[PDB]
Design a protein around this ligand. Sequence first.
Ligand SMILES: Nc1ncnc2c1ncn2[C@@H]1O[C@H](COP(=O)(O)OP(=O)(O)O)[C@@H](O)[C@H]1O
Ligand SMILES: [Mg+2]
Lengths: 19, 597, 54, 45, 166, 457, 454
Amino acid sequence: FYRLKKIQEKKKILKEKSD
Amino acid sequence: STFGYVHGVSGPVVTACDMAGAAMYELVRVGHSELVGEIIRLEGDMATIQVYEETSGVSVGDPVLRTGKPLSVELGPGIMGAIFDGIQRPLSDISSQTQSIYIPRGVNVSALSRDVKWDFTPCKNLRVGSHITGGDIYGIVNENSLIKHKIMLPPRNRGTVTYIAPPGNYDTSDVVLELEFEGIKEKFSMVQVWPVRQVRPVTEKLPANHPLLTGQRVLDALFPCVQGGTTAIPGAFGCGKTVISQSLSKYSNSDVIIYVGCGERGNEMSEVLRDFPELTMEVDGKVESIMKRTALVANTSNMPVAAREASIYTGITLSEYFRDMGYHVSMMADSTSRWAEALREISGRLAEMPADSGYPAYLGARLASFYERAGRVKCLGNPEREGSVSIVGAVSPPGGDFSDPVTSATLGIVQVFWGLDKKLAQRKHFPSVNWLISYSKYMRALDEYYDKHFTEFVPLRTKAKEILQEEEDLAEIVQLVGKASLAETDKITLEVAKLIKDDFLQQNGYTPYDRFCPFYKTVGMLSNMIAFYDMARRAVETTAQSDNKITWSIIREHMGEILYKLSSMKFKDPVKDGEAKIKADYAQLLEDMQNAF
Amino acid sequence: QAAMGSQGNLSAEVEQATRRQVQGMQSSQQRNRERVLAQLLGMVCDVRPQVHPN
Amino acid sequence: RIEIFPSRMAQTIMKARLKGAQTGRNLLKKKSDALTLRFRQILKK
Amino acid sequence: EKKEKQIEQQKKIQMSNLMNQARLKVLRARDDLITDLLNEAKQRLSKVVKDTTRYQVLLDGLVLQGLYQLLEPRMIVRCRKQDFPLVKAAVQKAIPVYKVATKRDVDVQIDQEAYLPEEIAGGVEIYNGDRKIKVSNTLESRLDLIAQQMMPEVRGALFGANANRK
Amino acid sequence: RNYLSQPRLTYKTVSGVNGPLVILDHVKFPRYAEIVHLTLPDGTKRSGQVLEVSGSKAVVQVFEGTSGIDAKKTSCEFTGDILRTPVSEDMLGRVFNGSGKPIDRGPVVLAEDFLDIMGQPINPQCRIYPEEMIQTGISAIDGMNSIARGQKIPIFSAAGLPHNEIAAQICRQAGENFAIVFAAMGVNMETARFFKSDFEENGSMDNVCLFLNLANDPTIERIITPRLALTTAEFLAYQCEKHVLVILTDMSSYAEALREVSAAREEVPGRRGFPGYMYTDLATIYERAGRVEGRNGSITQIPILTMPNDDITHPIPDLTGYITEGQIYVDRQLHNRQIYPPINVLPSLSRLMKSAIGEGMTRKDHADVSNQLYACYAIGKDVQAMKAVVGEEALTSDDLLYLEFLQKFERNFIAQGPYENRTVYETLDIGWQLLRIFPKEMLKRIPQSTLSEFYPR
Amino acid sequence: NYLSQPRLTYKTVSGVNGPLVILDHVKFPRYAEIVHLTLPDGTKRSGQVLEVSGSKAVVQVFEGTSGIDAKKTSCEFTGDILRTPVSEDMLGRVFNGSGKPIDRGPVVLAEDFLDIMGQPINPQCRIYPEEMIQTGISAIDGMNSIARGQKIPIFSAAGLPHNEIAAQICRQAGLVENFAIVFAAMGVNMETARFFKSDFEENGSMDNVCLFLNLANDPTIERIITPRLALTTAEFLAYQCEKHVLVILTDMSSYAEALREVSAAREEVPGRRGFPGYMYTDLATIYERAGRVEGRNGSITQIPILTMPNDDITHPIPDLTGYITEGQIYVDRQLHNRQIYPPINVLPSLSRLMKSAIGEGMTRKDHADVSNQLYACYAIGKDVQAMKAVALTSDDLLYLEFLQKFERNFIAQGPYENRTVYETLDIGWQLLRIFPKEMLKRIPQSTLSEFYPR
Ligand SMILES: Nc1ncnc2c1ncn2[C@@H]1O[C@H](COP(=O)(O)OP(=O)(O)O)[C@@H](O)[C@H]1O
Ligand SMILES: [Mg+2]
């Protein structure tokens, strides 16, 4: 639950870097 | 650029912008008080810096000046007997300077004293104009009465001697040697600077053949360690992982001792420096304290967590430097599980993905790059000396569970493993080394030494490990189906193995007779208790059915005086040396005659 | 007598088997040294600048 | 005292080991109780 | 049996180390036939540097190869001190060739503040405008590209081919 | 003399509130651990540390919770320094709340010095080792697990067990120069009243610095409660040279207030949800102990932690077992038999037992009889494990005495009663009587040179 | 088919973390390239390319990122895949982790350049392993004998002597005369490197061994490209030089552990216990390069040693290995505590190619039935031994006489004894002699008749 939530935050930071 | 600017702080790590020409693992100094830090990651224009002191009050507008050098120690005289922190600042100078009881968190105290003067003497046919290479001795400095700090050249450079200093007293900043190369005549001194993350170059590694006499009975007999070997001491809290480490630093057969406190207690390093200067040992008929040969790297739990990375790498760099003199260095890492918790806390700030149980994925590469720096090895340089480094690294698993990513990554590297037990500390069975799960892989390499000095001990431990092996399978029997239905060849096994567990394996480290036992005393009382089991084997085996034979209650009520000689054999204090071998055969002669009686 | 047999094996292979192998490839190198030299120097002179997916 | 490695499929194995040992006692309890009842009335006889 | 078993084992170790250095001497004597071959080839590139009617048709393409592979709006050619008038005629020949293939225009100035050292045989080192990306097309680097890809050929056509193949 | 006189800025530019973290914006040079003073739109005053900064942002965390914090109207008011507690010698007799404020209608303290609550680590070169043995009177603590003045040692207990009833006992009868600082983190109303009205009895209130923080108080205030309790005690000792006894209630309940704030930060869970740095943040509040060279003062810690589900392998007794200098275990089976200090001596060891005993300190047979009284205890405990299996009649004459000692050991060597203290000489003269129901030659831990005197009596 | 365009050289790194270096502004980068990082100190480090994206490319250096700047380093792009120089002369020498020599020797003269990833075989034209390799170990050849070309690991645990039974199947490697061992050492200590380097010169066998070594001193990224580069020389000697090879990769668990560090630094979504999801395929491309082709005369067999963490066969490293290979050899801990060498547990160890490498034509008629029956009395003997500690039948003591005689006399054979298969079945039949004729159920009467009375 820590490794999957780390990717859920890193999929958002990579998203807002595109936006 | 020549410095940086802080961009964001979060615990130990520091993000610093305007930092372009800075390599990985540089040494920068962040803040107005200049906290010493190391770069661990950089992304474009910014760098991410772990800080070896407590970041508090560090603002964004603080300057970060860089030095262009990795984290490095200062190797030279003035290093034995002192006590350092993780980044090698002396804790005795730091309290005689500021006169406080705290470390002021910004002080650049020199690692070696540039004021005390040592009597130098050259290396006796080191001529001017002679050829010299990297790593040979060009002078001797007697730091104490016990230790001759052999001054060496750095391994990088070499040349031809143009000037050597005459024998006398010098500072640690005086020029002692000047060497001509193709381009530039280069100056030198008595100190040298070496990066702690880089392994010291050396000629060629050698196999390890001589054992490390630790003085414990269970350690020297069943699971022996050699000088040049790696050892791990796991076990839960209150088991005694440091009283074996403090017994190693007091009574080993090693030339120097380096004790590394990594996340340890503050009172346990004050325990060391108090009782060491009254423990005098002999080398050549002269007695002097063990603080002449002990150098403490002290980094307690109160001190910051990024410095726990540095105190392991510093203490192995001093251990590698004293290896190059030829001394048989030992090192007590204590404890590496608090070093692995420093890797977890640092990687938690960098948003690293974790491995099993929190730790980063490179945990097996940091422990392997530290434990493999041990081993006896012919050093660099012309005087042709052979040194050693023996690493004994304590491991503190949480809850006493050896299925842990620190321990399970350790046991793939270490050859010896002294598995301490928590049940063996409730019952006061000290040392608490669990003889079943513990092992050593030095045995096939050590019997060649045994076929030269102690030529009867290899068949002894083969039966001594066997009697402890058969006791464990029969212990589960008597706790389920009772001891009444047991055989007579097994009831003798249950007594001598219980006779081993209080004589041989138990050892009161605070009494004058068992605080350090030599190896003849250890092989002495084992050559009798195994011969007792071998003689009481014949009392049941040969006369098995016919005669109304020995049912061993015959033995236990009649041979109680000889068993009292066995149960009190461990009481031979070191005032008798040759008498102990006579009493070993005398108590055997009481054991010899009673099979006829 | 094994030590003179073992040193007799030293003076039977390091001076003929090592030496004729260096000399035996020295002669084959010399007969073919110039053919691959024009092959190499003919390849340092071939320049053809192609530029790929645009 | 811990026996084997956790965290998959040893739980179902140990639940099979427990269930056999749970009624294994109760089967042996009825054996020891019927033996005692055979022992109690043979005392009065 | 400790007197005869060691002297046959130490005979085996002595036979093992002698057989190994019999292999390591002939393999190191295989390098000096290859290393001087690359040294004798490095001599004969400098003779190609001498005759200008062969050296400038070489430097016509050797600058052209750098311009095509780099594909920058602004490039910078760096060369030796002596070849500065030679590559200047070579680059101006190469300008309306680059505009034929690649449609992109280009600019290719030749710098004055920096020159290649004298130990280089010849060739150029063409950079971009940002001084980051570099195409090293010198003759000490063009030879080592062809020397590695021809290592199967300069073994079989210079020593005996192996008797155990496909 | 040395101070800062620049006026403080007042930002109305909060940007992000998710859980207890208030992300500010357009901050100009924020330091790492500044206290900020939130001013809520309904006039409420909240305080908070800065958790981490990055560029222009500054992520503070509020102490009193985040409920009610707006985005437009709230005015976070910075302060350019670290958290400095107001500390004085007249904080001795007053009851303080969680953060820093008085409870019993008193005034704010005048505070001749301001100290950093994070403290500074003591130089281990000038940190002298505790040798002076303190007297507690409880025979399980005084005689069998002797603690020295300066030693850190917890009390391992669970819920329902009377840890707080015997911790006030050693707070009562420990031994004109003895001060006590008390920290209550996560106590009930009763326990905070039981501790308040116990020091109202013995007249010890003239040397008690009770820090109460009840269960209704905010959960981030439990972080800075044992910080202020120690830097107070690092001022009554180390700067005024008097012997302070720090007692931290519910060190378990401090750690759930450490787990909760770290799950809000979303960082690196260790064992059982507790954070990765949970060894360090239990060490910066445990290693403030011991004596130093140039001071006559001392500070000794007796923390109390309730191990969950009676497990010593839970991370709360585990990580404190590695950093303290011993432990004291309170047993639940002995509490069910109405044994008074319901302590069992087998997993309760004191590390400084080897130094505090001797001919110079206390009665040379004391250090050696405790090696033997563990042996008769540990062997006899396996006898009751054997008595459950085979039967009460299959025991031999050896292991009938191991049950005979073990029944007499619990009720005679322990259970002093809640108001009786007995000295170490009374402990040994009631402890040697338990070894005299044993015969000779089975006391194998005792040498014959010492056994010859005390056995005939 | 050679490339000749001059290689570009980028001085434009823009990020470095762990083993990765992230580049910008790259013009047409290529996947799985090889680069040459030139440090500001003049050091040269190489590296693959893990992911391209537009003008970016994240390389993984082999020798660690320690010292790499952000402005002064230069990274030169070789325009091809990592192709090793392979030769017949790569036999009798010692190489490091990636490709460099150790014993003061030369670089190899590159008879051909081969891809380290290999190229996939046609499964139609791959002949089946039939000829049996005699290992000399009674625990192998008696129970779970290995065929030539069969891939079969040795499942060890940390501390167990798996290296002494690795060198045991070197000296006693033979059929029932050009057996070129290719060795790959990953994550081994120096004292385990001396046990392998100075045990091939002891028997004089160093004229055909190609010992690779990647010590714990050497960096961890080189462990990735060790079994791909140790097999492609073994793939050269066995399919292109018609020589029977035997490759013994060592410590596969460490090879995985180096795969976890790169996977965690790439921030990929992970699998079971931190390992990447593609570890099944990553352990398949270095395991399935075995067997023998039908067009040639050579062969390549694989014995990859791996330690399981905490003696767990359900760990992902022995789990995915048992799904790619053809059965395991489970050297056990409890047999090592009873002082057995080799301490091989014959219950979970298995060979899927023992059924077609034994019989009347290959070895002898009674190999098929004595291996099932010795397995039968061992498996039935174990659960009745567990009930023994906590009687009831006079035949149950017969099964525990089997357990006392099996571990001491059959599998235990010492460090230098090489039992042939003709000697192995005779000791196996003597263990069945303590059982009656009727209790051997899984032996038919046609084979039980002439072999049981002797
Ligand atoms: N061989 C021994 N001799 C004397 N005391 C011992 C011995 N072994 C263990 N002990 C005792 O056990 C306890 C363990 O001390 P310590 O090493 O600090 O625990 P830990 O290993 O968790 O750090 C101490 O009270 C120590 O005196
Ligand atoms: Mg310890």
